[PDB]
Amino acid sequence: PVARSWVCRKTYVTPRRPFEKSRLDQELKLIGEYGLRNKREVWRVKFTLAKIRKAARELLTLDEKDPRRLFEGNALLRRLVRIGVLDEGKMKLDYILGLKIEDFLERRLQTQVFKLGLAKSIHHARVLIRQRHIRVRKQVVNIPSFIVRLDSQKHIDFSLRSPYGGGRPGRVKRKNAKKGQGGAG
Amino acid sequence: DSDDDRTKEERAYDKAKRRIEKRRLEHSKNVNTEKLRAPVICVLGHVDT
Amino acid sequence: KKQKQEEFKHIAVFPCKMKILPQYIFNSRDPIVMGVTVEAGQVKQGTPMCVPSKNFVDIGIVTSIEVNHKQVDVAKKGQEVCVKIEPIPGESPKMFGRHFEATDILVSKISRQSIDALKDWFRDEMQKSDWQLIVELKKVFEII
């Protein structure tokens, strides 16, 4: 009798077929194009899309003009709009079954920083996110798998402690200066 | 820099061994003259003695 | 080791080469009474007897060893003893002077299992002369 939780669920899912050409082809294509680490995060993005698709199928199973159907139909559509992946004009319940993995991966923090033009490459963007340089509305984020909301898209900039956004120079810069006045004097 | 060998696993304990025999040596150079340990006596003999 | 002797007494046969004395024959057939002198090895109960010069035909199984009508179990080399030999059941009885004579040197019939049995644990009672006799009975019985 302890005060614990014991509440945990799996986020990714393992596919049924272990070896196949084409599945590996677009999985490697998505990993290479979006700068992902390995297949676990694309499997968990597939699992989140599977959850949303199952909820949409269950909600469309129920008949029209039921208050529960309208209730979490409006809730799910409002959540998908607030993420920003869904367009405002596509305000319909059966449009949930018409988007794919790259739409969810478009709202990643890594590719949002890469499209903002303050980073050179996608892997350079992932390193720059990973190494505590970008704040999200006066709050630094060091992880790449961050879902940027639509309201927070226009408030992404460098950290004030980072040397890129204005601050103290880095460790190798002062070491280079110390070597410079060591060799000069 | 080349101070130790290629792997630090067999070179890291050398400083620890140097400190444990210098602790052994120093404990043998600061010694007391009186109030030493308790000696041992050793009873032996034949059966039915 | 006492129990090992008791249930391995029949399977263990000591080697023995025996020299026959002339004209000391009493019974020629059923049983075999012949006063025969030990020249090599030792004689025990149940030891078979054969002839090497007559393509290895067994004589019979012994019953008792008598030294001047006194039953002695073990007889060493150089003693004139009297041995009562009985024919084996299932085979025909033998007679003296026709099947075998007094001009033949008699040896004990031994088996390779008996040699192995004397090798494994019988180190105490098997001497250097008995080892040489073991080598000779290996070299005469066409066994390796």
Binding site: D25, L28, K29, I31, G32, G35, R37, N38, H123 | - | -
Partner: protein, 57 residues
Amino acid sequence: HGSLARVGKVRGQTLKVAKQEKKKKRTGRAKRRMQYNRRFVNVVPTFGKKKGPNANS
């Protein structure tokens, strides 16, 4: 020959060689993208059986 049933025969009498230079890693960002663009851009699909990436023939 020695004997038929002596264990570790071909393990014992085989020759011994050493290793080579250390390879690098990019955690599959170009480690598998190199074989992807080898199979896509470099190697053309020839009408036949197959054409593998490790085919040293």
